[PDB]
Scaffold this active site. Structure first.
Site, PDB file in Angstrom:
ATOM      1  CE  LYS B  44      19.200 -12.381 -85.991  1.00  0.00           C
ATOM      2  NZ  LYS B  44      19.583 -13.795 -86.405  1.00  0.00           N
ATOM      3  CB  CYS B 131      13.612 -11.587 -95.421  1.00  0.00           C
ATOM      4  SG  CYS B 131      13.516 -10.992 -97.157  1.00  0.00           S
TER       5      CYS B 131
HETATM    6  C1  LIG Z   1      23.743 -18.216 -85.038  1.00  0.00           C
HETATM    7  C2  LIG Z   1      23.638 -17.628 -86.414  1.00  0.00           C
HETATM    8  C3  LIG Z   1      22.786 -16.565 -86.702  1.00  0.00           C
HETATM    9  C4  LIG Z   1      22.699 -16.024 -87.977  1.00  0.00           C
HETATM   10  N1  LIG Z   1      21.880 -14.952 -88.236  1.00  0.00           N
HETATM   11  C5  LIG Z   1      21.910 -14.398 -89.444  1.00  0.00           C
HETATM   12  C6  LIG Z   1      21.230 -13.162 -89.667  1.00  0.00           C
HETATM   13  O1  LIG Z   1      20.576 -12.613 -88.747  1.00  0.00           O
HETATM   14  N2  LIG Z   1      21.307 -12.625 -90.892  1.00  0.00           N
HETATM   15  C7  LIG Z   1      22.041 -13.152 -91.884  1.00  0.00           C
HETATM   16  O2  LIG Z   1      22.177 -12.565 -92.984  1.00  0.00           O
HETATM   17  N3  LIG Z   1      22.758 -14.313 -91.717  1.00  0.00           N
HETATM   18  C8  LIG Z   1      22.682 -14.947 -90.527  1.00  0.00           C
HETATM   19  N4  LIG Z   1      23.472 -16.044 -90.343  1.00  0.00           N
HETATM   20  C9  LIG Z   1      24.278 -16.621 -91.410  1.00  0.00           C
HETATM   21  C10 LIG Z   1      25.706 -16.122 -91.330  1.00  0.00           C
HETATM   22  O3  LIG Z   1      25.710 -14.682 -91.486  1.00  0.00           O
HETATM   23  C11 LIG Z   1      26.572 -16.739 -92.379  1.00  0.00           C
HETATM   24  O4  LIG Z   1      26.015 -16.297 -93.660  1.00  0.00           O
HETATM   25  C12 LIG Z   1      26.562 -18.303 -92.332  1.00  0.00           C
HETATM   26  O5  LIG Z   1      26.667 -18.691 -90.933  1.00  0.00           O
HETATM   27  C13 LIG Z   1      27.843 -18.828 -93.090  1.00  0.00           C
HETATM   28  O6  LIG Z   1      29.059 -18.334 -92.604  1.00  0.00           O
HETATM   29  P1  LIG Z   1      30.000 -19.274 -91.676  1.00  0.00           P
HETATM   30  O7  LIG Z   1      30.304 -20.495 -92.470  1.00  0.00           O
HETATM   31  O8  LIG Z   1      31.182 -18.381 -91.345  1.00  0.00           O
HETATM   32  O9  LIG Z   1      29.131 -19.624 -90.438  1.00  0.00           O
HETATM   33  C14 LIG Z   1      23.506 -16.588 -89.026  1.00  0.00           C
HETATM   34  C15 LIG Z   1      24.343 -17.650 -88.709  1.00  0.00           C
HETATM   35  C16 LIG Z   1      24.434 -18.166 -87.448  1.00  0.00           C
HETATM   36  C17 LIG Z   1      25.377 -19.304 -87.211  1.00  0.00           C
HETATM   37  C1  LIG Z   2      10.907 -16.203 -88.635  1.00  0.00           C
HETATM   38  O1  LIG Z   2      12.216 -16.264 -89.294  1.00  0.00           O
HETATM   39  C2  LIG Z   2      12.684 -17.483 -89.492  1.00  0.00           C
HETATM   40  C3  LIG Z   2      12.113 -18.718 -89.024  1.00  0.00           C
HETATM   41  C4  LIG Z   2      12.780 -19.908 -89.291  1.00  0.00           C
HETATM   42  C5  LIG Z   2      13.988 -20.046 -89.936  1.00  0.00           C
HETATM   43  C6  LIG Z   2      14.576 -18.785 -90.366  1.00  0.00           C
HETATM   44  C7  LIG Z   2      15.786 -18.799 -91.020  1.00  0.00           C
HETATM   45  C8  LIG Z   2      16.411 -17.620 -91.518  1.00  0.00           C
HETATM   46  C9  LIG Z   2      15.856 -16.343 -91.239  1.00  0.00           C
HETATM   47  C10 LIG Z   2      16.560 -15.211 -91.655  1.00  0.00           C
HETATM   48  C11 LIG Z   2      17.631 -14.860 -90.572  1.00  0.00           C
HETATM   49  C12 LIG Z   2      18.794 -15.787 -90.561  1.00  0.00           C
HETATM   50  C13 LIG Z   2      18.903 -16.711 -89.495  1.00  0.00           C
HETATM   51  C14 LIG Z   2      17.928 -16.865 -88.336  1.00  0.00           C
HETATM   52  O2  LIG Z   2      17.731 -15.822 -87.667  1.00  0.00           O
HETATM   53  O3  LIG Z   2      17.536 -18.007 -88.125  1.00  0.00           O
HETATM   54  N1  LIG Z   2      19.884 -17.748 -89.545  1.00  0.00           N
HETATM   55  C15 LIG Z   2      20.742 -17.837 -90.582  1.00  0.00           C
HETATM   56  O4  LIG Z   2      21.618 -18.713 -90.648  1.00  0.00           O
HETATM   57  N2  LIG Z   2      20.607 -16.937 -91.598  1.00  0.00           N
HETATM   58  C16 LIG Z   2      19.657 -15.897 -91.675  1.00  0.00           C
HETATM   59  O5  LIG Z   2      19.618 -15.063 -92.590  1.00  0.00           O
HETATM   60  C17 LIG Z   2      14.589 -16.328 -90.559  1.00  0.00           C
HETATM   61  C18 LIG Z   2      13.937 -17.565 -90.114  1.00  0.00           C
END
Ligand SMILES: Cc1cc2nc3c(=O)[nH]c(=O)nc-3n(C[C@H](O)[C@H](O)[C@H](O)COP(=O)(O)O)c2cc1C
Ligand SMILES: COc1cccc2ccc(CCc3c(C(=O)O)[nH]c(=O)[nH]c3=O)cc12
Ligand SMILES: Cc1cc2nc3c(=O)[nH]c(=O)nc-3n(C[C@H](O)[C@H](O)[C@H](O)COP(=O)(O)O)c2cc1C
Ligand SMILES: COc1cccc2ccc(CCc3c(C(=O)O)[nH]c(=O)[nH]c3=O)cc12
Lengths: 313, 313
Positions: B44, B131
């Protein structure tokens, strides 16, 4: 119980219309859209001169939506102007004309000529801000300074209420910046959200090949793929542009989908991919379906729920 | 006929791994991914301090995908560094550690301390360029100057090969710009395309409500909605960054989807939404399905077809 509404000093039988580029390129297509049950029609985005467009295949559809790189095939501005001035039957429904000149000068030249026909006949301008910018630059609406220039120049040249067709945005800062640009113009009375989700790539597993010829297979996405993007853009601009109308476009296949766009803030609802795939019969189905969901909910008007999407806590 | 690959000085039994954020937040989650048939895992995305994250509901899924605004809930960097240093069993598979500091200085602080563990244990860094930046500015990878700053400062602080997680782009010009900046940084050895399609809006028709609480329902989209966007981005970076690997992420639910990613250029294939929905058993299914497609086509290895998508004449 009927879906008629009034917007932009025109009366509409219902909120449905084609999306620009679909079933609107030729006189035959415009006649067909005029004969349909749609509330309105919009013409194919035009350029000053006629264009063949890109090589085929340039449109393909799939269960989840479509990809296209048409390349502005169109009959040229003179044709669409003549349609608006001499051929369209305004007693049947309103007409929107979409302009997508390849420079600001070209858009100014076209709008200066549209204005008297707008005054005389009531044709409405939808200015396509996915019109190509200078090559090597992003599309105009993704370049906020160019976007401001185009609108300055068009506003001056045209001098009458118009609307703009927007690409989707994906970042809240960008919603804020774009909406602020638009709100600098008082002549911008409607905002159509959204054009196709840009530069997707569909690949066929069996043949191992892209499915369209232009741009190495890259093209704009429409249909089911793009409904949540579309809804977000509709709502973002609805919230940010309280003195404008928002027109929803993207992912409409059913009266439920139309209902979602209206809840998000849409005043008209445009149908692209689904109309290309099903044909103009889709408009009676959509109206029936939207009226059924209204009746089940107890809603007697669009205004009762437009923009009334609920947030949590 | 095998799915095994050798890259970044590691050996992988197959290309599949979780996408960052899914099934990777706690020790339990990481042991579960390690026990699965996935060829690798990623943690994560973390911050220096442990974060509670955005209020619930903050993730929802539907037949065509998911929406989320999680808000970086995570156990904090020290936890993930300990997992990398002391708990992970590297004889089972490789580990990627994802970081997502909220400022350039936070990222630098973390990568300085990850370096010696990377060198000794071989954990791989994935730097998340979604980020958040300063609020009211676009996310880091949509602010090219910010992106360049982050990559300069992390390259100097870390001093080892790493990769980056990229949001999707939607413009041909935009794709070129991303390639131009990443190619300034020789230590950037892999590009993971894509993170969630930003700021979509899912609306439930029955309740007339958005479905997640943060950000008035806005959130990032994953799943079937985003496969053509994902493929476009994989292929766009694969073409523009010939000295880097591209890992594909977006819309993978089957071996057929993975095969398309690989044809577009992907080397690892990451699984987000579909893994969230199905659980880690998905990996044996994807392996079997990909092997079945390879067997029908006569391909014995992944390099036979990686990046070999055909274009139309
Ligand atoms: C619940 C959730 C949490 C995620 N948290 C992150 C994260 O911490 N860091 C990140 O690079 N992408 C995060 N993503 C994005 C996924 O890594 C991925 O790039 C995006 O969901 C697209 O892939 P998919 O179509 O297989 O869901 C998150 C996605 C989901 C659904
Ligand atoms: C304080 O960090 C955030 C507040 C609101 C929305 C955010 C969305 C993306 C991220 C980066 C982590 C991440 C998340 C997440 O942790 O929400 N979800 C994704 O689908 N992709 C990501 O890369 C931080 C957020
Ligand atoms: C074949 C085709 C041609 C189109 N041409 C135009 C155009 O000329 N002008 C324009 O504003 N949008 C054009 N679009 C975009 C659509 O108006 C619409 O914004 C997009 O397809 C999303 O709506 P949908 O999900 O209903 O397809 C075109 C779309 C398609 C599929
Ligand atoms: C020279 O005009 C173009 C070349 C290549 C791609 C193009 C994409 C969009 C446009 C604007 C017209 C348009 C088209 C189109 O005519 O390709 N398709 C869309 O989905 N939306 C649009 O707005 C022109 C292009």
């Amino acid at each position: 119980m009927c879906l008629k509404l009034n917007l932009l000093d025109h009366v509409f039988a219902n909120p449905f219309m084609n999306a620009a580029g679909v079933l609107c390129s030729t006189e035959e297509d415009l006649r067909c859209m005029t004969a349909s049950s749609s509330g309105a029609l919009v013409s194919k985005s035009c350029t000053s001169a006629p264009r063949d467009g890109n090589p085929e295949p340039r449109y393909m559809a799939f269960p989840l939506g479509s990809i296209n790189s048409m390349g502005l095939p169109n009959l040229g501005f003179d044709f669409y102007l003549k349609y608006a001035s001499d051929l369209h039957d305004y007693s049947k429904k309103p007409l929107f004309l979409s302009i997508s000149g390849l420079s600001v000068e070209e858009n100014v030249a076209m709008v200066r000529r549209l204005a008297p026909v707008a005054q005389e006949k009531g044709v409405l301008l939808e200015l396509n801000l996915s019109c190509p910018n200078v090559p090597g630059k992003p599309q105009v609406a993704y370049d906020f300074e160019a976007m401001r220039t185009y609108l300055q120049q068009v506003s001056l040249a045209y001098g009458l209420p118009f609307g703009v067709k927007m690409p989707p945005y994906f970042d809240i800062a960008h919603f804020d910046t774009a909406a602020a640009v638009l709100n600098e113009f008082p002549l911008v009375k409607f905002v159509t959200c959204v054009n196709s989700v840009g530069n997707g790539l569909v690949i066929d597993a069996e043949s191992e090949s892209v499915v369209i010829k232009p741009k190495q297979g890259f093209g704009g996405l429409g249909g089911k793929y793009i409904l949540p993007t579309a809804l977000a853009n509709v709502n973002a601009f609805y919230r940010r542009c309280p003195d404008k109308l928002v027109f929803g476009c993207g992912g409409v296949y059913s009266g439920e989908d139309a209902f979602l766009h209206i809840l998000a803030g849409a005043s008209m609802v445009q149908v692209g991919t689904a109309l290309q795939e099903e044909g103009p019969g889709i408009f009676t189905r959509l109206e029936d379906e939207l009226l059924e969901i209204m009746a089940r909910k107890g809603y007697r008007t669009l205004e009762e729920f437009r923009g009334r999407v609920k947030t949590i806590e």
